Design a protein around this ligand. Structure first.
Ligand code: HEM
Ligand SMILES: COc1cc(/C=C/C(=O)O)ccc1O
Ligand SMILES: [Ca+2]
Ligand SMILES: [Ca+2]
Length: 306
C-alpha cells in the first residue's frame, strides 16, 4: 500500500528539496509548475505512475517522449533531473523517480496557489518505456466526452468526478494554436467554428491563432487567471469559454448529464474543487504502481540502472 510517510525516516527533506527546485525555476520559467503537473499525468496514464515517461531512447525500446501527446509538447525534463540530483545528494539511492515526480506535481500545484497535501509514496521505477501504450492511452483535445470517459476508464479512473476534477489542471498552463484551429475555423468538417465556443472569445482566439498562422504559438488555458491554480477554469466552461474541445465538452456535450453538475459544483466553490482535485489526484497517483522490490530506485531518471 502506498503511504504518505514513506520517506519520513529515510529522506525527511525530499519534499523541501523538490519545492526549492521549483521555486527557483519558476523565477525564470513561470510555466514550469504547469509543465510538471502534466508530466505526472502523462506518466500515470501509461503503465501507471512508474516514471516510464522519463526514460530516453535505447536500441530496444522507444521513448514515450516521441508520442503524439508528448513530442514537441511535454517539457521540464531537465528540471526533474535537477531535483533528482539534489535529492540523490541528500539521500543516496532512496527516492524513486516515480515518487519524485508525484511530489513535484503536488508541490507545483501548491506553489501555483492550489491545495496542499501529502501524496501517498512508495512507488518504484519501470525497467522500460511504452511509446505505443502512450499513443493509445493519452486522451486527445479533439476527443468527444464519450472518448474522454473511455480514456480515463481504460487506465482505471471510472468516476466522472475524476475526469471533471483532473481536467481542472487546465486552470493554468499553455496550449498551441495547433489544437484549436478546427474549433476556430472548421469544426468537424462543417466549415464553421465550433458552436459551443463563446462568439466573443472566438474572435479573441482567432486573433491569437489566425488561419495559416504559427501553429506552435501558445495560448493560455485559463483566460481568467493564466498562471494561478484556482477554480476559474470551471467558471469559463459555464460561459462557453473552455479553450480546447475536451474542456468544453465537460459542460456542453450531449453526454454531459453527469458532468454538468460537477462543473457547476466546482465553479461555485473553491473548497469543493480543491477537495475533489486532491481526491482525484491521489486516485490517479494510485494507478498500477510498482512497489516493494518490484522495479528499481532509478539513479538517473533517464536510464535504467546499470
Ligand atoms: C481530459 C483530457 C485531457 C486532454 C485531452 C488534455 C489536452 C491538453 C493539450 C492538447 C495540452 C496542450 C499541449 C501543447 O500545446 O503542447 C495540454 C496541456 C496541459 N495539460 Fe492537459 N489534457 C487533459 C488532461 C489533463 C490532466 C489530467 C492534467 C493534470 C491533472 C493536465 C495538465 C495539463 C497542463 C498543466 C497543461 C499545460 C502544460 C504546459 O503549459 O507546459 N491535462 N493538455
Ligand atoms: C498533444 O496531444 C496530441 C497531439 C496530437 C497531434 C497530432 C498531429 O500533429 O497530427 C494528436 C493527439 C494528441 O493527444
Ligand atoms: Ca508511466
Ligand atoms: Ca487559473
Amino acid at each position: 500500500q502506498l503511504t504518505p510517510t514513506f520517506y519520513d525516516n529515510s529522506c525527511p527533506n525530499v519534499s523541501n528539496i523538490v519545492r526549492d527546485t521549483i521555486v527557483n525555476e519558476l523565477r525564470s520559467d513561470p510555466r514550469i509548475a504547469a509543465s510538471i503537473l502534466r508530466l505526472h499525468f502523462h506518466d500515470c496514464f501509461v503503465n501507471g505512475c512508474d516514471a516510464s515517461i522519463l526514460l530516453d531512447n535505447t536500441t530496444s525500446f522507444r521513448t514515450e517522449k516521441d508520442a503524439f501527446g508528448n513530442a514537441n509538447s511535454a517539457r521540464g525534463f531537465p528540471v526533474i533531473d535537477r531535483m533528482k540530483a539534489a535529492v540523490e545528494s541528500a539521500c543516496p539511492r532512496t527516492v524513486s523517480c516515480a515518487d519524485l515526480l508525484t511530489i513535484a506535481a503536488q508541490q507545483s500545484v501548491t506553489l501555483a496557489g492550489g491545495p496542499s497535501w501529502r501524496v501517498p509514496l512508495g512507488r518504484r521505477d519501470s525497467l522500460q518505456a511504452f511509446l505505443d501504450l502512450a499513443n493509445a492511452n493519452l486522451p486527445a483535445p479533439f476527443f468527444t466526452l464519450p472518448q474522454l470517459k473511455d480514456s480515463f476508464r481504460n487506465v482505471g479512473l471510472n468516476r466522472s468526478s475524476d475526469l471533471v476534477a483532473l481536467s481542472g489542471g487546465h486552470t493554468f498552463g499553455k496550449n498551441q494554436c495547433r489544437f484549436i484551429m478546427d474549433r476556430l475555423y472548421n469544426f468537424s468538417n462543417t466549415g464553421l467554428p465550433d458552436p459551443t465556443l463563446n462568439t466573443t472569445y472566438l474572435q479573441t482566439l482567432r486573433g491569437l491563432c489566425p488561419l495559416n498562422g504559427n501553429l506552435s504559438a501558445l495560448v493560455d488555458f485559463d483566460l481568467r487567471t493564466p498562471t494561478i491554480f484556482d477554480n476559474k477554469y470551471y467558471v469559463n466552461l459555464e460561459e462557453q469559454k473552455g479553450l480546447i474541445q475536451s474542456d468544453q465538452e465537460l459542460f456542453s456535450s450531449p453526454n454531459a448529464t453527469d458532468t454538468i453538475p460537477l462543473v457547476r459544483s466546482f465553479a461555485n466553490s473553491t473548497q469543493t474543487f480543491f477537495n475533489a482535485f486532491v481526491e482525484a489526484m491521489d486516485r490517479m497517483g494510485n494507478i498500477t504502481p510498482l512497489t516493494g522490490t518490484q522495479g528499481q530506485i532509478r539513479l538517473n531518471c533517464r536510464v535504467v540502472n546499470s
